Amino acid sequence: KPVPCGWERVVKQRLSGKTAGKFDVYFISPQGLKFRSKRSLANYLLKNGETFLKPEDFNFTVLPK
DNA sequence: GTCACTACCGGACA
DNA sequence: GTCTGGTAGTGACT
């Protein structure tokens, strides 16, 4: 839940230059897409935030041999 | 206006 | 992938 299923969140802290100490946070989607901002992720979620399930996504069988 | 702070995004790197 | 700086937006205010 806190990080949506299959997504990854990265937090990093800058160590040098004028912005030393500032944090950067970005997310990686289940497909490997990297979002460095809430704006860009929000825009993407408009059309691509839905996930769907089919019966074929669930394997009810045990293989032989 | 300044100031402090947040947020987005491009680009340098070899 | 790693790493940040420039720009812009918000809002309180001696």
What domains are defined for chain A? 1-65 (3.30.890.10)
Bases in strand B with any atom closer than 7 Å to a protein CB: 7-9
3-state helix, strand, coil in chain A (%, to 5): 20, 20, 55
Q: Which residues pair with A28 in a beta bridge?
A: A8, A34
The CA distance from A55 to A53, in Å, is 7
Reduced to 3 states (helix: H, G, I; strand: E, B; else coil), residue A52 is: coil
Biggest alpha carbon–alpha carbon distance for chain A? 64
Resolution attained, angstroms: 2.0
Bases in strand C with any atom closer than 7 Å to a protein CB: 1, 3-6
Residues in chain A: 65
**CB–CB of A18/A38 below 8 Å?**
no
Q: Which protein residues have their Cβ less than 7 angstroms from some atom of strand C?
A: A 12, 14-20, 24, 34
Look-up of token digits 């979002």: A35
A19 touches strand B (CB under 7 A): no
Query: In sequence order, what are the residues at sequence separation of 6 or more whose Cβ sits closer than 8 angstroms to the Cβ of residue A26?
Result: A9, A10, A34, A35, A36, A37
The CA distance from A2 to A5, in Å, is 9
